[PDB]
């Protein structure tokens, strides 16, 4: 393969369990790594 | 304990700074309202067994079904522990009238109470109905002074809103 | 403190 | 182990300096009481078994769970250990009262008593209630004349009660 | 104060009352331009938590100077600020550049995660990343695994939770927490178990063995012991400290067996006498009567009170008593 | 973490030899008795809350110094924490009964529980009484000798499982003793 | 701003709970001490140019070396900005007498002042000596009331201990 | 975060003017009316749980599509989250009423609540109905016109506080509109 | 963390007795003497930096081996850390004087300070001298017997507060002693 395993990258969107969070913490997690390519 | 002093020294310790004028200004109001809340607490201390007896029967008068078998008030051991828990809550209210804040309530009666009362099948509405009966039997000039009654009913409403 | 496999084998034999 | 006289000297060597005259008339006053202090310890050591047994009897008429089967006061071995644990604290309170300082009380009585009682499962709050009941009987027995000259002893019984409260808060 | 009753609580007077009071949650996404003291609280709370009460001079505080500035508009509190200041030289100098690797690892668990490593696999999962990829993937492995976003809000400061039940840890890890976190007046240079060069848990964290909890500020709080082997295969030397075992026949001869730790031994005051012996002193050999302070014992139950008298009449101070 | 199957693996890996023949009798009897094991863990799991509440209430009603002012189960916070400690232990004993090996009970529950209760000032011997009450409930629920509730089982003999869960419970009581 | 209200709503917001009795009890003391601090602030507002002119002179009199060339008080542009900065500090003290806490001082005059005064070669002892002179020229019945003088000198000592 | 006292500070710091004389009338009237304000805050705080539960029950009993299968308050998780969502807004409006300025309501509750409810799919207009029901409860509790419970007050006029809390509530409703 | 009011609460909760009558004399005298207490904490807080700098300079000028090469206050880093070490102790003693109880001093400052200074190699004797100099400054600042600066107080007697702060200062010395 490519290693002992193949976990998904933490630079991928939706890796943060956006539920039971504050409003400053919910919005930072639902738009974590998708912030880049709408500027594009 | 949540009080007037502890909030401002905890805030100054979190900021890492000396006590400023606002901290001392907050203690002047403690000096002001202690004249009412202490003589509320003393009148509660001098006549507590009458109030615990008076509020205990309102619970079983409103909910007579607790004395049925299978319920939580079957024999005398349950009713005695019911009166004991009501006396515990009145003692914590007397303590909060002394310390000036809701510290002794929040840590000795409220925190963790929901898991106990759900696990041990204790209905919270009847632990509430005694505190509700105690609040309504408070007349303004007879039982205490005017501001003492406000100070007493505020902690009673705090306990009621916490258990409900 | 209990080995259930050896106990099962000993009870079988 | 220090007495109250050795306290000021142990703080005088530390600064490396002679006792000034204000410490000296602080000490000659403490000598000038003198007889009152030993009258106090004489009254407590004359009635020690009565203090201990009446306090334990009031403790078990109050808390019957310790002598209930399964209680910490169950059987003879445990009951005997409880009878004279209180007599140990009474002995060391009398030592600290005759010394004028709670240095022997912290060294060899209250040092490590809390985790001792924790490691055995002994309820420390009931030990504290027993200490308080011994305290009340000791200050009650301390201020009677019983054929002594009339005077005030108030600053001495306050110190005697302070030793008991120091023992009571350190156990629990 | 000390105890477990008289407050109806145990955890605060175990040395944790300052940590039971603060939250520091950073309620807004960016700075208010105009306003600079509700973050100085947050930034200094972050400095006291992440550096673990180590003290930063203004000269060393002005070395960051951009991280905090980037935090004020375009970084999170929890992630990407504490992440970037673990990569700095001021953190690496006192948490990585003087300790060995497993020590630099278990200090990072306390600083970043707020707990202790559980067993050997916690150590091996983190040293593998260092040996494959260097320091920066090593420090980010503390942030971008599952635990960190599960435990901590993205704008809260990390808090201590190694004592807590709901962090699914072993109960030896509850007691490894108080080896490393002793009250609120302790940094990690200030710990006697870790001199900013030692590993605090070296044998005791790998082998998961538990270590008796002396509450700080107690009477015999000053207890400190070494570690030495005892066997001929490891070329050990017997006689240093008592084993936490109670192995053979006297484990029940004289009842329930305990392990008492005694800390203060010195030459004046051995005899039944309230004073020194006057003379040349010591011994022809020239050694002290107790050649080491911090001596432990393994003791029975009928033997416990004469040992108590033999400790306390000779100047000794009991640090701890735990049953075996 | 090892079950009954992994235990023979670790025992024969110290031997350095393949395992077959002799070592398979216990595993085939473990497989052939697996329906009773699932049937027993289900019976313990279905009655968990009544078991924990009954055990803590029995421990209090035998020793009323715990709810005494200054006792260890005095306030609501301490009582909720005791109920949680109670069954946290029931959860791990259920894990060990399902796995057929007590290795999961050692690693995650009992490793350091002895001095944790010491540092907390928890009376380590009323906990033994609560553990023994939970053990007595578990054997009666397994063997269908519960007086308050009778369940539905296929007829047969499973006192080996009752002795195994009694063997787990005294271990969980002796680790804190 | 560090004040009486803001500390307790920030504490209740950090805890995530409603305003209890201790919070309102802290505001009663604000109601009490506002009778002294507001008439301190008003008397400072009505006569500020006399105090600033007086304060500036004291610093120069103590440190006459600032008017030498190479120093920070050479020409009139430096002395005018010296009087302007002293007036700024007196205005912030008037603001803290109004808000009840040290908020406007801590954020508009104190935070960051050390880097500016070290970078621009401004000696802090002479920024301190004017505030020290202002404190000592305060008599108890003449300038204001008794508690107003306490409230004024407390903020003056806060500014002095911050810059020193 | 600014109260009524800090608001004149920030208004006069843009002036570089001292506060005294003209600007002190509002502050002295704020001080002289402080007992009614504390009293108003106390009356709202004492009836918080009944207010939140009554507001959410009224919003459901006017629009029964929320508890419809597939509605936004359908399951128990969503219903508990809605009760929490209402309770937090009541907490921040109480903070703003105590402080005498709505700056704390802007910074910690309403900054980004508009599109948070959008990303969640929360119907932003039933929330307006719940906010208006809470507003109608707050004015009746302040002015002692509550039909279910009367309180004890000294006699006088405090409709300025009722208009101020109504001015906070429509702001908290229009921020999510 | 307990103040003077909470101390009687914890003392009477071990009793399960109500507070009223006997126990109220100390609390009413604590309230009636509160202006002197605030008046004393203000006088200590206003002179903090001069007190810390004067105490550390006095400790050095009595024992010049600290600034000796190899001493514990030798470099600039150690001198700044010593000024910080003194300032923190003054802060906690001011907290304990404001609260009227030394419980906050035990929990956050003195719990483990004894062996922290041991692990650092900090000399125990010097710190006691600095603490005693700070104590001597505190009693003179409370009783207005300071020779360098005279403050404004209402006339009266408050040597009870001076004895209380002297009782806090030696307590700290004993813990690290
Ligand atoms: C009123 C009695 C309270 C009580 C007492 C109790 N103590 C024990 C056991 C021990 N107590 C000690 C205490 C000391 N040993 C010392 O050397 C000193 C001098 C400073 C003291 C205070 C020790 C060593 C033991 C264990 C040895 C033994 O007693 O056999 C016991 C029970 C005995 C046991 O645990 O097996 C009791 C009952 N406990 C209470 O319930 C009362 C409140
Ligand atoms: C089949 C042999 C296995 C083995 C044995 C082994 N043991 C040791 C060393 C010690 N063993 C003990 C054990 C006990 N002491 C007791 O009092 C009791 C009663 C409960 C027991 C079980 C102790 C104290 C030692 C150290 C002292 C010594 O033996 O000199 C050794 C090596 C000796 C050494 O370590 O220097 C061996 C080899 N080890 C194996 O490899 C076998 C599996
Ligand atoms: C959970 C789901 C999940 C994924 C699908 C991947 C998606 C993914 N791929 C890459 C990153 C990449 N993905 C590719 C792959 C390709 N480029 C090509 O030209 C080919 C068409 C194709 C291989 C077949 C390459 C080349 C990079 C690295 C780009 C770079 O290094 O600049 C990254 C950036 C982080 C990184 O890997 O460095 C991410 C998030 N990761 C995930 O976590
Ligand atoms: C210091 C704070 C403090 C408290 C507030 C109380 C809280 C409290 N109350 C009860 C316990 C109780 N509370 C009640 C009361 C009632 N049940 C009914 O049938 C009626 C609804 C109502 C009568 C008023 C009963 C019956 C018990 C005993 C429950 C049981 O043992 O089954 C218990 C369980 C332990 C026990 O009391 O035996 C606790 C911790 N105790 C405290 O220590
Ligand atoms: C063996 C040890 C030993 C002693 C203690 C003393 C006992 C003793 N005490 C006093 C003398 C005294 N004893 C007391 C004591 C008391 N009076 C009271 O009313 C209280 C009940 C009690 C206080 C606790 C007082 C107050 C005096 C002196 C009278 C005075 O000071 O006015 C005297 C008279 C001589 C003198 O005044 O010095 C003697 C002989 N002698 C000894 O040989
Ligand atoms: C797949 C999931 C699964 C379950 C939900 C349980 C359910 C279950 N229990 C048994 C079956 C059984 N369960 C028991 C156990 C008992 N009977 C008693 O009388 C005692 C009270 C108690 C043991 C102390 C016995 C004795 C059998 C009969 C078969 C056997 O002995 O294995 C069987 C197999 C026979 C059947 O289908 O009925 C099943 C599926 N077991 C499972 O495998
Ligand atoms: C993974 C395994 C695991 C456990 C077994 C528990 C073990 C455990 N229990 C407690 C904590 C406790 N455990 C108890 C329990 C009891 N005290 C008594 O008097 C009774 C004998 C008994 C209940 C039956 C109590 C009362 C506390 C709280 C002590 C306190 O609040 O001071 C704590 C401290 C943290 C906390 O809960 O606050 C821990 C780690 N937690 C775990 O994570
Ligand atoms: C004074 C306090 C006091 C109590 C609170 C009870 C508690 C209690 N229950 C049982 C004993 C038991 N407890 C249960 C548990 C239950 N039984 C049911 O019918 C329910 C389904 C479930 C929750 C109530 C079972 C199943 C048994 C044994 C067998 C049986 O009763 O059918 C035992 C005996 C344990 C032993 O043998 O050591 C005790 C002490 N008894 C007391 O003396
Ligand atoms: C709102 C809060 C606020 C303040 C507190 C002040 C603070 C302050 N003072 C000065 C600036 C100054 N302060 C002084 C004062 C002195 N130097 C001396 O020679 C004497 C020691 C002393 C006279 C009293 C001087 C001379 C400058 C100008 C420095 C320079 O431009 O070289 C500056 C630099 C900008 C400028 O004023 O030109 C600032 C920001 N300004 C503010 O906006
Ligand atoms: C220190 C803490 C503190 C409290 C717990 C509350 C309690 C409180 N309320 C009022 C006093 C009052 N409260 C009100 C308010 C009202 N009256 C009404 O009839 C309306 C229903 C409602 C406003 C809409 C009024 C009108 C007064 C009379 C005094 C005034 O107008 O300021 C007073 C001052 C007079 C008195 O002592 O009775 C106090 C202390 N206020 C506080 O300061
Ligand atoms: C500081 C301010 C602050 C708030 C205002 C809330 C705002 C808020 N609410 C929700 C989350 C929610 N809020 C609601 C509320 C409602 N939906 C409806 O249909 C009704 C109109 C209304 C109840 C009256 C519901 C139902 C959810 C959960 C949505 C879901 O579970 O998918 C979430 C997502 C995180 C979560 O709770 O899971 C956030 C940030 N939280 C905060 O921290
Ligand atoms: C079909 C669903 C349905 C409901 C759930 C209720 C909900 C409800 N309550 C009130 C209206 C009110 N609700 C309260 C709140 C309370 N009143 C009390 O007596 C308690 C102390 C407290 C919790 C119940 C108050 C105080 C008022 C207004 C005045 C009053 O009734 O005294 C209003 C009117 C709000 C408005 O004017 O817009 C509504 C819709 N009515 C409904 O039509
Ligand atoms: C609300 C915030 C607040 C403060 C800023 C301080 C300010 C202050 N101090 C005192 C008042 C006082 N302060 C002192 C204290 C002393 N006087 C001396 O001569 C000694 C040097 C020193 C004690 C050792 C005394 C003796 C009084 C007189 C009233 C009293 O005895 O309580 C008073 C009440 C009388 C008055 O208004 O003047 C006030 C408000 N106290 C506060 O409550
Ligand atoms: C050789 C080194 C050396 C020093 C650095 C000083 C340090 C110093 N100052 C004081 C003594 C004091 N120090 C202060 C503090 C102050 N006094 C003021 O006028 C200022 C406002 C403030 C900071 C300077 C006060 C108020 C006293 C006692 C009373 C007084 O002087 O008015 C003491 C006596 C403490 C004691 O009694 O034990 C010492 C040693 N003296 C020395 O011998």
Q: How far is the CA of G148 from the centre of ligand 14 (A)?
A: 29
The tokens describing E90, both together, are 């001021």
Instruction: Provide φ and ψ at B86, rounded to 5°.
Output: -65, -40
In order of D14, F128, I127, the CA distances from D18 in angstroms are: 11, 61, 21
Q: What are phi and psi of E320, to 5 degrees?
A: -155, 155
Indicate whether residue I29 lines ligand 13 (CB < 6 A).
no
Evaluate: CB of I136 within 6 angstroms of ligand 14.
yes
Task: Give the C-alpha separation, H4 to B119, whole Å.
Answer: 47
Token digits for D4? 């109250």
d(CA E156, CA E148): 12
User: Does I have 3 or more CB contacts under 8 Å with A?
Assistant: no
* D121 and chain F in contact, CB less than 8 A: yes
Facing F83 at nearest CB: one of B107, B109, B115: B115
Backbone dihedral region for residue B16 (phi beyond 0: left; psi -120 to 50: alpha; all else: beta): left
Q: Which residues, 6 or more positions from G99, have their beta carbon under 8 angstroms from its beta carbon?
A: G1, G3, H5, H6, H9
The burial class, CB within 10 Å (0-12 / 13-18 / 19+), for E17 is: buried
Give the separation between CA B51 and CA B126, rounded to whole angstroms.
Answer: 16
CATH number of the domain where residue B24 is located: 1.10.490.20
Dihedral over Cα of B63, B65, B70, B75: its sign: positive
Helix/strand/coil for E297: strand
Torsional class of E52: left (φ above 0), alpha (ψ -120 to 50), beta (otherwise): left
Identify any residues that bridge with E258 across adjacent strands, giving them in sequence order. Answer: E299, E323
**CA–CA gap between residue F101 and residue C1 (Å, rounded):** 8
- Give kind and range of the element (H or E) at residue B49: helix B48-62
Number of domains in chain B: 1
Would you report the helix, strand and coil content of chain A in percent, each value rounded to 5?
Answer: 20, 0, 80
Cβ–Cβ < 8 Å for E316, E264: yes
| Distance from C-alpha of H92 to C-alpha of H102, rounded to nearest angstrom | 9
User: Which experimental approach was used here?
Assistant: cryo-EM
* Contact residues for E24 (Cβ-Cβ < 8 A; gap 6+): B14, E41, E42, E45, E46, E156, E157, G14
Contact flag H107-E32 (C-beta cutoff 8 Å): yes
| CA H50 to centroid of chain Cα atoms | 15
Neighbours of D34 (CB within 10 A): 10
Instruction: Pick the closest to residue B115 from G15, F86, E163 (CA basis).
Output: F86
β-bridge mates for residue E261, sequence order: E296, E320
Contact F151, F144 (CB under 8 A): yes
CA distances from F79 to A40, E7, E279, I122 (A): 58, 15, 60, 44
Cα dihedral angle (H167, H171, H173, H176), rounded to 10 degrees?
180
For chain G, say whether I49 makes contact (Cβ under 8 Å): yes
State how far the Cα of I89 lies from the Cα of I122, in Å rounded to an integer: 15
Query: In angstroms, rounded to a whole number, what is the distance separating the alpha carbons of residues B100 and B39?
Result: 12
* Residues found in chain B: 164
* Sequence-distant (≥ 6) Cβ neighbours of residue A8 within 8 angstroms: A15
Show Cβ contacts of residue E290 under 8 Å, excluding neighbours closer than 6 positions.
E265, E266, E267
Pocket lining: G146 vs ligand 13, CB cutoff 6 Å:
yes
Q: Do E55 and I84 touch (CB under 8 A)?
A: yes
3-state secondary structure chain H: CCCHHHHHHHHHHCCCCCCCCCCHHHHHHHHHCHHHHHHHHHHHHCCHHHHHHHHHHHHHHHCCCCCCCCCCCCCHHHHHHHHHHHHHHHHHHHHHHHHCCCHHHHHHHHCCHHHHHHHHCCCCCHHHHHHHHHHHHHHHHHCCCCCCCCCCCCCCCCHHHHHHHHHHHHHHHHCCC
* CB of D116 closer than 8 Å to CB of D123: no
Pairing verdict, β E295-299 and E258-262: antiparallel
Establish whether residue E305 lines the binding site of ligand 1, counting it when its CB lies within 6 angstroms of any ligand atom: yes
E3 touching I (Cβ < 8 Å)? no
Q: List, in sequence order, every residue forming a beta bridge with E322; answer none if it has no partner.
A: E259
Q: Is B111 exposed, middle or buried (0-12, 13-18, 19+ CB in 10 A)?
A: middle
State whether residue E211 is helix, strand or coil.
Answer: coil
Name the residue of chain H whose CA is nearest to E26's CA. H108
| Residue showing tokens 């790594």 | A33
**DSSP for E137-192, written as a single string:** HHHHTTTSSHHHHHHS-TTSPP---TT-SSS---SHHHHHHHHH--SSS--SSS-S
Question: In this structure, which residue's CA is closest to atom 40 in ligand 7?
Answer: E165
Burial readout H134-159 (b: 16 or more C-beta within 10 A, e: otherwise): bbebbbebbbeeeeeeeeebeeeebe
Half-sphere exposure for F107 (CA within 13 Å, toward CB): 12
Contact D130, D86 (CB under 8 A): yes
Residue C2 tokens read as 């209990």
At E299 the three-state DSSP class reads strand
Check if the beta carbon of residue I44 is closer than 8 Å to that of residue I29. Answer: no
Secondary structure, 3-state, chain F: CCCHHHHHHHHHHCCCCCCCCCCHHHHHHHHHCHHHHHHHHHHHHCCHHHHHHHHHHHHHHHCCCCCCCCCCCCCHHHHHHHHHHHHHHHHHHHHHHHHCCCHHHHHHHHCCHHHHHHHHCCCCCHHHHHHHHHHHHHHHHHCCCCCCCCCCCCCCCCHHHHHHHHHHHHHHHHCCC
Dist. CA D113–CA D122, nearest whole Å: 11
What torsion do the CA atoms of E1, E3, E8, E13 make, to the nearest 10 degrees? Answer: 50
**Tokens (6 digits) for E27:** 């309620």
**Residues on chain E touching B108 (C-beta within 8 angstroms):** 8
Rg (CA), chain F: 18
Q: Return the SS3 of D17.
A: coil
Instruction: Spell out a b/e string for H53-67, using b for 16 or more CB atoms within 10 Å of the CB, else e.
Output: eebbebbbeebeebe
Q: Would you call E320 helix, strand, or coil by DSSP? A: strand
Q: Provide the H-helix boundaries in chain E.
A: 38-50, 58-61, 67-74, 82-86, 89-95, 101-108, 120-133, 135-140, 146-151, 172-180, 203-206, 304-312
Whole-number Cα distances in Å, B40 to B30, B129, B147, E288, I16: 15, 22, 9, 65, 19
Tell me which of E23, E25, E26, E27 to substitute to probe the interface with H (most H C-beta atoms closer than 10 Å): E27
Q: Is the CB of residue D70 less than 8 Å away from at least one CB of chain F?
A: yes
Name the helix (H) or strand (E) containing I53.
helix I48-62
Q: Which of E215, E187, E294, E17 is nearest to I116 (CA)?
A: E187
CA-CA distance, G159 to G129, in Å (whole number)? 11
Distance from CA of I66 to the nearest CA of E (A): 19
Order across the sheet with E258-262: list the strands: E295-299, E258-262, E318-323
Provide the greatest CA pair distance for chain B: 61
List Cβ neighbours of E111 (8 Å cut-off, separation of 6 or more). E49, E50, E51, E52, E86, E95, E158
Q: Which of E21, E24, E36, E43 to mutate to test the interface with G (most CBs of G within 10 A)?
A: E36
DSSP, collapsed to helix, strand or coil, labels residue D123 as coil
- 10 Å CB burial of residue I42 (0-12, 13-18, 19+) is buried
> How many CA atoms within 13 Å lie on the side-chain side of E202?
13
Q: Which residues contact D106 (CB under 8 A, 6 or more apart)?
A: D170, E219
Angle between helices D113-120 and D124-142 (to 10 degrees): 130
* B27/G30 Cβ within 8 A: no
Distance CA H125, CA I74 (A): 68
Q: How far is CA D34 from CA D41, D151, I43, I139, I159, in A?
A: 11, 13, 40, 31, 28
Neighbouring CB atoms inside 10 A of H71's CB total 16
Query: What does the alpha-carbon distance between residue G6 and residue G10 come to, in Å, rounded to a whole number?
Result: 6
Burial I161-170 (b: 16+ CB within 10 A, else e): bbebbbebbe
**Which residues fall within 8 angstroms of residue H114, CB to CB, at 6 or more apart?**
H124, H175, H176
* 3-state SS, residue D4: helix
Residue for token digits 């990343």?
E129
Any binding-site annotation on G139? no
Residues contacting ligand 6 via CB (< 6 Å): F 35-36, 38-40, 42, 142-144, 153-156, 158, 161
Neighbours of I153 (CB within 10 A): 17
Q: Whole-angstrom Cα distance, residue E49 to residue I73?
A: 26
* Rg of chain G over all Cα atoms, to the nearest angstrom: 18
CA atoms within 13 A on the CB side of E320: 24
b/e burial code for range A18-30 (CB count within 10 A of at least 16 → b)? beebbbbbbbbbb
β strands within chain I, DSSP E: none
- Give CA–CA dist H164/H158, Å, rounded: 10
Strand partners, E298: E259
Residue F174's closest CA among F128, F138, F133? F128
The Cα–Cα gap between H124 and H115 comes to: 10
Q: C-alpha distances in angstroms, G86 versus B136, E34, G64, G91, G102?
A: 60, 22, 17, 9, 17
Alpha-carbon distance F8 to F31, whole Å? 14
| 3 state DSSP class of E245 | coil
Q: What is the CA radius of gyration of chain B?
A: 18
* Ligand 10 centroid – CA H42 distance (Å): 10
Residues preceding gaps in chain G (C to N > 2.5 Å): none
For the Cβ of E281 lying below 6 angstroms from any atom of ligand 2, the answer is no
3 state DSSP class of E217: coil
- Measured between CB atoms, which of D108, D112, D115 is closest to E313? D108
**Do E and H share at least 3 CB pairs under 8 Å?**
yes
Bridge partners of residue E299, in order along the sequence: E258
Distance CA B82, CA B27 (A): 38
All residues at 6 or more sequence positions from G143 whose CB lies less than 8 Å from its CB, including other chains: G43, G149
- Compute the distance between CA of residue E315 and CA of residue E293 in angstroms, rounded to an integer: 11
Could you write out the three-class secondary structure of B63-130? CHHHHCCCCCCCCHHHHHHHHHHHHHHHHHHHHHHHHCCCHHHHHHHHCCHHHHHHHCCCCHHHHHHH
E121 contact A CB<8A: no
Indicate the burial class of I177 (C-beta count within 10 angstroms; 0-12, 13-18, 19 or more). middle
Report the SS3 class of residue I6: helix
State how far Cα F21 lies from the chain centre: 32
CB B67 within 8 A of CB B60: yes
Candidate of G28, G146, G147 to mutate for ligand 13, largest count of ligand atoms within 8 Å of Cβ: G147
Q: Which residues of F touch B113 (CB under 8 A)?
A: 76, 80
In Å, how far are A17, E82, E274, F6, F66 from A14, measured between CA atoms? 7, 22, 72, 37, 48
Burial F100-139 (b: 16+ CB within 10 A, else e): bbbbbbbbbbbbbbbbbbbbbbbbbebbbbbbbbbbebbb
DSSP H/E element including E262 = strand E258-262
Query: How many alpha carbons lie under 13 Å from residue H143 in its C-beta half-sphere?
Result: 17
The residue among G54, G81, G78 whose CA lies nearest residue G68 is: G78
- As assigned by CATH, the class of the F1-177 domain is mainly alpha
What is the distance between the alpha carbons of residues I177 and I175, in angstroms, rounded to a whole number? 5
* DSSP sequence for E22-36: ------SSS-BTTB-
CB distance A8 to ligand 3 below 6 Å: yes
The alpha carbon of residue I100 and the mean position of all alpha carbons in its chain are separated, in whole angstroms, by: 12
Domain span at residue G51? 1-164
| C-alpha distance from E298 to closest chain A C-alpha (Å) | 48
**Cα(H94) to centroid(ligand 3), Å:** 50
| B contact chains, 3+ CB pairs < 8 A | E, F, G, H, I
Residue I133 contacts residue I59 (beta carbons within 8 Å): yes
The residues, any chain, with a CB within 8 Å of residue E80's CB and separated by 6 or more, are E71
* Buried/exposed G90-120: b ≥16 CB within 10 Å, e otherwise: bbbbbbbbbbbbbbbbbbbbbeebeeebeee
Ligand with an atom nearest the CA of residue F46:
8
Residue E93 backbone dihedrals phi, psi, to 5 degrees = -70, -40
Collect all residues with Cβ–Cβ distance below 8 Å to E238 and sequence separation of at least 6: E230
Q: Do chains F and D touch (3 or more CB pairs under 8 A)?
A: yes
Is the CB of I119 inside a 6 Å radius of any atom of ligand 13? no
């Amino acid at each position: 393969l490519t290693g002992y395993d193949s976990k998904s990258s933490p630079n991928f969107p939706n890796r943060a369990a956006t539920r039971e969070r504050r409003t400053v913490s919910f919005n930072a997690r639902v738009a974590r790594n998708k912030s880049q390519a709408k500027k594009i | 304990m949540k009080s007037v002093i502890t909030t401002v020294v905890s805030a100054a310790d979190a900021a890492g700074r000396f006590p400023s004028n606002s901290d001392l200004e907050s203690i002047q109001g403690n000096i002001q309202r202690s004249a009412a809340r202490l003589e509320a607490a003393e009148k509660l201390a001098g006549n507590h067994e009458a109030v615990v007896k008076e509020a205990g029967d309102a619970c079983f008068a409103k909910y007579a079904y607790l004395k049925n078998p299978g319920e939580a008030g079957e024999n005398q051991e349950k009713i005695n522990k019911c009166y004991r828990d009501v006396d515990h809550y009145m003692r914590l209210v007397n303590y909060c009238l002394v310390v000036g804040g809701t510290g002794p309530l929040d840590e000795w009666g409220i925190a963790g109470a929901r898991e106990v009362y759900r696990t041990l099948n204790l209905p919270t509405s009847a632990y509430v109905a005694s505190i509700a009966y105690t609040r309504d039997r408070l007349c303004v000039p007879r039982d205490m002074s005017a501001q003492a009654g406000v100070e007493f009913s505020a902690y009673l409403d705090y306990l009621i809103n916490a258990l409900s | 403190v209990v080995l259930p496999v050896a106990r099962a084998g000993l009870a079988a034999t | 182990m220090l007495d109250a006289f050795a306290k000021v000297v142990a703080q005088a060597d530390a600064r490396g300096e002679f006792l000034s005259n204000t410490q000296i008339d602080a000490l000659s006053k403490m000598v000038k009481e003198g007889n009152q202090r030993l009258d106090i310890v004489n009254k407590v050591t004359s009635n020690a078994s009565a203090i201990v047994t009446n306090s334990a009897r009031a403790l078990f008429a109050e808390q019957p769970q310790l002598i209930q089967p399964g209680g910490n006061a169950y059987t003879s071995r445990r009951m005997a250990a409880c009878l004279r644990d209180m007599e140990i604290v009474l002995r060391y309170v009398s030592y600290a009262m005759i010394a004028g300082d709670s240095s022997v009380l912290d060294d060899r009585c209250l040092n490590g008593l809390r985790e001792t009682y924790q490691a055995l499962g002994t309820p420390g709050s009931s030990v504290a209630v027993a200490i308080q009941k011994m305290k009340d009987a000791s200050v009650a027995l301390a201020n009677d004349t019983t054929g002594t000259p009339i005077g005030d002893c108030s600053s001495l019984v306050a110190e005697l009660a302070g030793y008991f409260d120091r023992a009571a808060v350190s156990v629990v | 104060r000390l105890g477990t009753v008289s407050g109806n609580s145990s955890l605060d007077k175990l040395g944790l009352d300052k940590f039971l009071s603060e939250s520091n949650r950073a309620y807004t996404p960016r700075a208010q331009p105009g306003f600079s003291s509700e973050y100085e609280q947050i930034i200094s709370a972050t400095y006291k938590q992440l550096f673990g009460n180590a003290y930063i001079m203004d000269s060393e505080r002005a070395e960051m100077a951009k991280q905090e500035s980037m935090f004020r508009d375009g970084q999170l509190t929890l992630k990407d600020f504490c992440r970037a200041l673990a990569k700095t030289e001021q953190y690496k100098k006192r948490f990585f550049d003087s300790r060995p690797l497993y020590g630099a690892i278990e200090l990072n668990f306390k600083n970043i995660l707020g707990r202790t490593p559980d067993g050997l696999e916690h150590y091996r999962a983190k040293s593998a990343v260092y040996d494959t990829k260097g320091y920066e993937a090593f420090v980010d492995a503390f942030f971008d695994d599952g635990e960190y976003d599960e435990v901590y809000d993205d704008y809260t400061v990390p808090f201590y939770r190694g004592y807590k039940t709901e962090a699914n840890l072993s109960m030896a890890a509850f007691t490894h927490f108080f080896r490393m976190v002793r009250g609120s007046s302790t940094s990690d240079k200030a710990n006697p178990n870790s001199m900013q060069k030692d590993i605090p848990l070296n044998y005791y964290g790998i082998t998961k063995t538990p270590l008796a909890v002396i509450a700080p500020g107690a009477a015999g709080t000053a207890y400190t012991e070494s570690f030495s082997g005892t066997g001929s295969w490891q070329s050990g030397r017997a006689g240093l400290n008592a084993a936490r075992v109670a192995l053979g026949v006297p484990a029940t001869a004289n009842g329930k067996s305990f392990r008492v730790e005694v800390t203060g031994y010195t030459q004046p005051g051995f005899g039944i006498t309230a004073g020194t012996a006057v003379g040349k002193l010591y011994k022809a050999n020239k050694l002290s009567r107790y050649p080491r302070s911090n001596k432990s014992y393994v003791v029975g139950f009928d033997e416990l009170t004469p040992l108590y008298q033999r400790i306390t009449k000779n100047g000794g101070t009991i640090a701890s008593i735990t049953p075996l | 973490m090892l079950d009954a199957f992994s235990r023979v693996v670790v025992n024969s890996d110290a031997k350095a030899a393949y395992v077959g023949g002799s070592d398979l009798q216990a595993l085939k009897s473990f497989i052939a008795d697996g329906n009773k094991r699932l049937d027993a863990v289900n019976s313990i799991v279905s009655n968990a809350s009544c078991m924990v509440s009954d055990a803590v209430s029995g421990m209090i009603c035998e020793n009323p110094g715990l709810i005494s002012p200054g006792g260890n189960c005095y306030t609501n916070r301490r009582m909720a924490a005791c109920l949680r400690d109670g069954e946290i232990i029931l959860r791990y004993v259920s894990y060990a009964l399902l796995a057929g090996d007590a290795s999961v009970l050692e690693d995650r529950c009992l490793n350091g529980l002895k001095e944790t209760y010491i540092a907390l000032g928890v009376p380590t011997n009323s906990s033994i009484r609560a553990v023994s009450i939970m053990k007595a409930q578990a054997v009666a629920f397994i063997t269908n000798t519960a007086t308050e509730r009778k369940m539905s089982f296929a007829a047969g003999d499973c006192t080996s499982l009752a002795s195994e869960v009694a063997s787990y419970f005294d271990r969980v009581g002796a680790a804190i003793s």
